[PDB]
Design a protein around this ligand. Structure first.
Ligand SMILES: [Mn+2]
Ligand SMILES: [Mn+2]
Ligand SMILES: [Mn+2]
Ligand SMILES: [Mn+2]
Ligand SMILES: [Mn+2]
Ligand SMILES: [Mn+2]
Lengths: 314, 314, 314
C-alpha cells in the first residue's frame, strides 16, 4: 500500500508563530528516509505554499478566518486526490487547524471513515464558545454534522460540509477541556478516554474498547490525527500548549502499534511540533524524535523487532 | 456544602525550617480563588499564630514536644468548631505533625470517620522507636487507640485521645518504612498499599479496594491527609524527605478524583510543601502547582472537563 | 542461605572501555555493607584478574574472541565452585558477555535452572548475524542448545556446552532487536515480554506469567541476569547502549521483589554499569544507586518495610 507525505507549514490558527517550521524539522530528522525502510512505498508530495489572504479582518473573535479557511480548502484538494489514487496520506503540519482540510478531504473519498483524535484538548470550541480567536481548538466543530447550524458561518469555511458524526470520533488523552467543550461532548454523546480513564483501564484496555466502538459493527478506514501535546511535556516539550500528566512515550507508541495491527490506517496527522519553542536544543530533538517514532510505528516499526520476510538470517 | 481553609504555618516537627512558608506559597498560587470557581463556598479562616513555648526541653529523644503539642491542641480547637458548623476543613500546613490536631478535632465531631493517608512514609514511629526526635513521623502513633499506653506520655499531648483504630486507616504510596514502623503495621493489621502493591494492581484497582474496606460496611466521613512526598520527587521536589519511585502526577490526581466521587470528603490535609527547598524556582512552582491541582480535584475539577449546570452553551 | 559476591571487571565484549570500573563504583556505593544488613551472610570473593591474551586476532568480524573466551571460562570456574558450596552467586561486572561463564558455571551445578533475562536487547546475535564484532549481544547464542552447530566455533569457546534450551529462558524489557535476533526468537519459540507486552499487561501480570511458564511444571533454581539498560535512560543513564521507553525504577524493583518471594534466586547478574559514561556525576550516582536497590530487593529489601524477626519494637 502506498504512503504519500504532505507538508502543511501553516500557523494562522494560533498566536504562536513557529509551527510553520515543523515539517522541516521532522524531515530534517530522517522522517522520509526511515519510512522507505518499511514495507511501504513513500512519496514526498512536498510542502504546500499557502497564499496569504490580505486584509483578513477578524470574524467577531476568531482570528485570520479566511487565511485558515482558504489554506484548509487547499489541503482538502490535495488529500482527496492522493486518497483517490488509493494512497495513505500523512500530513506533517502546522497547528491543528489543518485537520479541517485533512479530514474533510479524506471523507470525500472515504465517507465511512472514523476518527481517532489523540490530544490533551478536545479542540471542539465553536466560534462562539472560544475565549480566544484561535482556531486550533475549533477544527472538530467544523467537522461534526451535529454541530452544523449551531454557530454562524465563518468567512472561509463554506466549502466544508460536516462529514462525520459525534459517533465516528474517539478522544484519547484529554486533560484540558473548556467548560464550553465539555458541555458539547456531554451533549453529543462523544466517546472519550480522558487521562483518568486511561489511568483506570490502562492504555491496553483503552485501545481495545475504542476499536470495538468504531470498528465493532463494520470495518472502515481510520483517520489518526495526533497532536504532539497529548504526550507529557517531558517527551514532547516543543508544543505551544503543553499540559502535565500526559500519555507517555510508551503509551504513545502503544496506540500506534495497535492502529497498525488493524490494517486500516487510512490517514495520519502529526500536529503541533513547534521547533522554535524548545527552551534548549535538547527539547526540540526530543519532540522531533518521538514524533518520528510515532509515524514509523503507524507503518510497521514494532518494539519487539522486525525481520524482513522471505529472508533466512542464518 | 461549605469549605473552610485553615493555615497551619508550623515547623517544629522537623529539623528543616521552611515549611512554615507553605500556606503562603499555596495561597500565592491562586489556591483560594480557584476554589471559589467550583460548586462549593470557600471561606479563608486565615493562618493560625502558634505561640512559641519557651525552654521547651527535649523529651528523651523527641524534639520540641510541648511546642508541637500546644500548637496541635490549637488546630484541634479550630477544626472541631468548623466541622461543628457542618463545613469541610482544608488545612494548609506545615510539616505532617499537624495531623494530630487536624484528625483528632475532626473525630470529636465525626467519631466514625476513616483515614486515607497518602504518603511515602507511615509516620507511625512512637517516641521510643524513632531514630530522630522528629515528630513528623509520629503523628499516627498519637492517633491510634491500639497504640495507647505503648509508649510514655509525651509532655504536651495529654489533650489527645486515640480516636481511630488501626482498622479505620489505609496507607497509599509507602516506599520508605522504618524497621520499627513496619513491625507496628504488621502487628496491628493495618491495611496498606505500598508502591509495589500499586505496581501490581494499578492505582484504579487500589482505590476500588480501599473504598470497599473503609466504606464497605457503613458509609462514613473520610479524612484525606496528603503528604506531598507521596508523589515522586519529579512532580513535588520541594519536600524535606523526597523518595524515588513515587505515585505520579496522574495517579495523584486519580486518588483525588475518586475520593470526590464518593461524596464523603470531610477533612483534607496538604502537608510538607517547603517553598525554601526547591533547588530552583522551577521546582517550587512545580510542587505548588501539583498541590493546588490535588486540592481542586478533591472538590470537583475533573480531567474530562467541567460545564456548569442548568446552562446551555449552544 | 549464603550470598557470595564476585567482581568481573571485564570490557572486551565492547568498543566502550569503561565498564571495567563497574564493580568498583557499586562497591564504592555501599553494595557489600548494605547486603550484610539483610537476613543473608555475605562474602566478597573480590575482583577477578583476567589475564590478557596477546595477539588476539579478530575471528571474521567478532572482536577479541580468545580474551573474551578465556576470561569467561574463568568466571565459569569461580561460579561453579561457589555454587558447589551451596551459595548464591552475585557477579558484578563488566559488559554482558560475562553471562556466558556466569550462566554455564551455574548450570554445571544446577542443570535444571531457568534464566530470566531483563534487558532492552536480546543479546542473541550469532557470530554471523552480528553487524559488529561485539560480543555483548551474543552471550545467549553461546548458551542455547538449539543454536549449537548453527555458527562456526569461535576460538576460545570450546569449553562451553550449550546448557539451557530456548524454553528455559524468558526475556523482559525488549525494545531494541536486530532483524537477525528477532528471526531467531521467532524460530526457536522463545518466551518474551517486549516493552509493548509490558504496556499491555502491566508488569504485575507479566511476572505472574513468566513464573507459571518457567516454574509452572517443576520448581527449579532461577538465574537472574540484569542488564542495567533494561531500565529507561532516566534512571540508569550510565550504559553504553541506552534506549528510550524502558522499564521504570518502580517496575525494575517489582521484578526483583517478586523473584525474591519465590525463594528460588540462585544466581544474579548486574551488568553494563559504566561509571565513565555518566555525562555528569549525577548520572553515575543515579545508575549506581538504582543498581544497588535492585540487588538488595533480590535479597529481602521490600518497599513496604522490613522489621527484624523475634523482636518486639514496643
Ligand atoms: Mn489539537
Ligand atoms: Mn492539543
Ligand atoms: Mn507525613
Ligand atoms: Mn511522608
Ligand atoms: Mn545485554
Ligand atoms: Mn542490553
Amino acid at each position: 500500500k502506498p504512503i504519500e507525505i504532505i507538508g502543511a507549514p501553516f500557523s494562522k490558527g494560533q498566536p504562536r508563530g513557529g509551527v510553520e517550521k515543523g515539517p522541516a524539522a521532522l524531515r530534517k530528522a530522517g522522517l522520509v528516509e526511515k519510512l522507505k525502510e518499511t514495507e511501504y512505498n513513500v512519496r514526498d508530495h512536498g510542502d504546500l505554499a499557502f497564499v496569504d489572504v490580505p486584509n483578513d479582518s477578524p470574524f467577531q473573535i476568531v482570528k485570520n478566518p479566511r487565511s485558515v479557511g482558504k489554506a484548509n480548502e487547499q489541503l482538502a484538494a490535495v488529500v482527496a486526490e492522493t486518497q483517490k489514487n488509493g494512497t495513505i496520506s500523512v500530513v506533517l503540519g502546522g497547528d491543528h487547524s489543518m485537520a479541517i482540510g485533512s479530514i474533510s478531504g479524506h471523507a470525500r473519498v472515504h465517507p465511512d471513515l472514523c476518527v481517532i483524535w489523540v490530544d490533551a484538548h478536545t479542540d471542539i470550541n465553536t466560534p462562539l464558545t472560544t475565549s480566544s480567536g484561535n482556531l486550533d481548538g475549533q477544527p472538530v466543530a467544523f467537522l461534526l454534522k451535529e454541530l452544523k447550524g449551531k454557530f454562524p458561518d465563518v468567512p472561509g469555511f463554506s466549502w466544508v460540509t460536516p462529514c462525520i458524526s459525534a459517533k465516528d470520533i474517539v478522544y484519547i488523552g484529554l486533560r484540558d477541556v473548556d467548560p464550553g467543550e465539555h458541555y458539547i461532548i456531554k451533549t453529543l454523546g462523544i466517546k472519550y478516554f480522558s487521562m483518568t480513564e486511561v489511568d483506570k483501564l490502562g492504555i491496553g484496555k483503552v485501545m481495545e474498547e475504542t476499536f470495538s466502538y468504531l470498528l465493532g459493527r463494520k470495518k472502515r478506514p481510520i483517520h489518526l490525527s495526533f497532536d504532539v501535546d497529548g504526550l507529557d511535556p517531558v517527551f514532547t516539550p516543543a508544543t505551544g500548549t503543553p499540559v502535565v500528566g500526559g500519555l507517555s512515550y510508551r503509551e504513545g507508541l502503544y496506540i500506534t502499534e495497535e492502529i497498525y495491527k488493524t490494517g486500516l490506517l487510512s490517514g495520519l496527522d502529526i500536529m503541533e511540533v513547534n521547533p522554535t519553542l524548545g527552551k534548549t536544543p535538547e527539547e526540540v530533538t526530543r519532540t522531533v524524535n518521538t514524533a518520528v517514532a510515532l509515524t514509523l510505528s503507524c507503518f510497521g516499526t514494532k518494539r519487539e523487532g522486525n525481520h524482513k520476510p522471505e529472508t533466512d538470517y542464518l
